[model samples]
Target: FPVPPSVDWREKGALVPIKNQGRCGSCWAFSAVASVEALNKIKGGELISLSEQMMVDCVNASYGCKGGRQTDAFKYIKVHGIASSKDYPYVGVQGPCQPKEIVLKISGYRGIVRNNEKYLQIIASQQVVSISIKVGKDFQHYKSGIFNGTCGDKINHGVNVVGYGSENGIPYWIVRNSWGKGWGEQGYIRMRRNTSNPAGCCGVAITPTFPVID
Candidate 1:
């Protein structure tokens, strides 16, 4: 496995369509919802959009569109559960938390072994993983190629990890951003991984957690 692995969940049809978070700092909600959606497909065999506004309206543990934390959002989901986005569409802004019939709930959540790339790959191999990142200027402008840009540990946003691979000998994590298809590489990013920095480029290793479907 010296060359690492070449995998992609898209090939397995495991992920829902890319979503647009619009003009909001709700990236935390996007990643949280994406992780649940992926596990919903993995556990129940159906993937539906989960509510982000729910987090904004309900998850008082975290902030709304201004900012939020992935783990806290998951906790809110565990206790209050959630519904489909179709039922509670995203407005990209803070709004009312109209509770509806919970279409799905999470059993538990676990974090990848801290600073462990192999563990991240192992976990991501089975399901989508949620991660936070210190979004630098280069990332916001990334178009393609294994991302080895200017980034560090100042986690300000959330994203999802769908798969991993290498290009031209550079290994990377297949990350799914929520800025929309017009943003980066069709709403996705391939961030360089397995680098000398075990903390992960862009601080992706900081909050690498995922929800368990039950």
Candidate 2:
């Protein structure tokens, strides 16, 4: 492996629990919050879950529950900051924003070079990262094992990648999904990475991003 054979942020205690985004199409905000939670912990805030509700309501750059984008969430976090879920709370039902006590915020977000698996590995080694991908219609009922998709490049869903590892000699990304603990491998999905496709495996090559700590 050009990167490492293994890495896991959860094992390092930087991972928060798996979250369920409910029936909302707010995976974008959830994934962004996951990135923030992991980074905040990596920077010493104790891995507190952030509010996706606040993002849905206040991140004006994005639409609400109907849809959202992680980049817009990161942009809003840079300017408006974000609050802990305990303070702001997630209703999963649209609600008010920031609204933060101005507590947690990111300096900005950075993207891995498109099609470059090396950068993705390097950055992920530092902290959990946000990944958005376009999934196939039949891709959601994942049980176990590495996922190398039959999906198109139409990126849709978002997730937090905690680390990298190998599954039967195939390298994969250990991703935490916002689908609760009963799905996939206890709310996580392992995706095959470092493919010949520069876009990276699946659509991760296109929109791999993470919040930058100041």
Candidate 3:
């Protein structure tokens, strides 16, 4: 309950610029990297842009550009460590695993309580968290404002919960997407939170997770 009214990692200078995943379904990779980047800044005092392509091509738990999960990416990063964008870079399409310098590593990752928006907000206020949500046609055309569209529980997309806040009494979770700055609000979306449903807005609370650094 002791959470700020609003929390934006970008404002805290813990986040990098929005990145586009192109046609590849590497949203989970982007999500994982975003969380790691934020945690590295918060804990390690460094905000290095980790490579998502490393996860796409290296993490055996994931299916390259086909799809992946944040936990799998985190697990791989924990053991193998991750390369920086400057070293590995992103190619959009999956290719041979050409890793470079191991920039940072996470001790592990943890998940939030299911359908618990309150806990999610408390944690997000301090650091970014990884999450999955259902994206519909409306999401593809999302331009701005609080997204309160009619979306279901078919969680198919992975993203980062950068922050949460209320607008005009309407509580919303500030989410970072890998769709480039041209879409949404500079590649971020404010999704409605504290709804009646336990899954929160657009199933965001279903699978909320975050990385840990030591």
Candidate 4:
């Protein structure tokens, strides 16, 4: 069994919810929202699921729903503040933002974990962590598979790291893919964790620096 050396596994972790990227290339919004959701859970024990679409539509100052970087998304949160899914509501259908002032008490940081061996072990052990991984160029076209193939070049999207575990000796990382539940194993995929540089296909793992209430 693969295990991470530096981090322990018994700590309380956070659960990140999945976002629907849809046709718009707004994976950055999804990743950002997932991290904030986890942080909210950690800080106030608030398990309320937020909407990435809300950020995509409202955070026009940062990046459009098409796409964006993680750092930029975090900065947007710091400046504009994220809205709750209840207040905004995700239509799943893309459109312009309906600007509104929704209270957000979540905070996050930019901390990306470079690909390394034993990464999966660290994930399984850690309570809550987010990763930005490269997806196969064919991922957008991927209908189904155990996802046991190599992630080709040209990372066109991003997702959130929710959890990790082992199944039949094959270490798998639980991820909230934007493709929805109908795609992978019910909106999630278990990739080969604890392997060397598994970023090409599976999304990369990232940890938010000290998630707290804003």
Per-residue lDDT, model 2, residue 176, is 86
TM-score of each: 0.94, 0.92, 0.97, 0.75
lDDT tens digits, residue span 1-214, model 4: 4545333121344553445667777777776777677666666665667767767766655566557665566666777777777777776556686775555745546463555435434443434454566576545455544456656555455666566666666666666677766777667765666655544235454333223355
List the candidate 3 regions with Cα displacement exceeding 4 Å: none
Q: Give the 10-residue window scoring lowest on summed lDDT in candidate 2.
A: 94-103
Work out how many backbone clashes candidate 2 has. 4
Instruction: Give the lDDT of residue 46 in candidate 1.
Output: 78
The ten-residue window of minimal lDDT in model 3 covers 147-156
Error of 2 at 196 (Å): 2.4
Candidate 1 residue runs with Cα over 4 Å from true position = 1-4
Model 2 C-alpha lDDT per residue in residues 1-214, reported as the tens digit of each score: 3456689999988987888988988999998988998898888776677788889989877878888889999999998888777888777777655435756779999888777777888888888889887777545867888887578547888888899988678998898888899989999988888888877766776778999988
The 0-to-1 C-alpha lDDT of every candidate, in the order given, reads: 0.84, 0.83, 0.90, 0.58
* TM-score, cand. 1: 0.94
Order of candidates by lDDT, top first? 3, 1, 2, 4
Q: Report the candidate with higher TM-score, 1 versus 4.
A: 1
Clash total of candidate 4: 12
Residue 9 lDDT in candidate 2: 94
lDDT of 1 at 100: 83
**Stretches of candidate 4 exceeding 4 Å from the true structure:** 1-19, 60-62, 92-97, 117-124, 137-146, 198-214
Measured with C-alpha atoms, the lDDT of residue 165 in candidate 3 is: 81
Task: State, as a TM-score between 0 and 1, how close model 4 is to the true structure.
Answer: 0.75
Candidates 2 and 4, the one with greater lDDT? 2
Query: For model 3, how does the per-residue alpha-carbon lDDT over 1-214 read when each residue is reduced to its tens digit?
Result: 6878888889888999999999999998999999999998987577888899999999887998999999999999999899999888888999988858898778999999999999898889889999999888887788999999877448999999998888899999899999999989988999999999989888999989999988
Best candidate per lDDT, number? Answer: 3
Model 1 whole-model lDDT (C-alpha atoms): 0.84
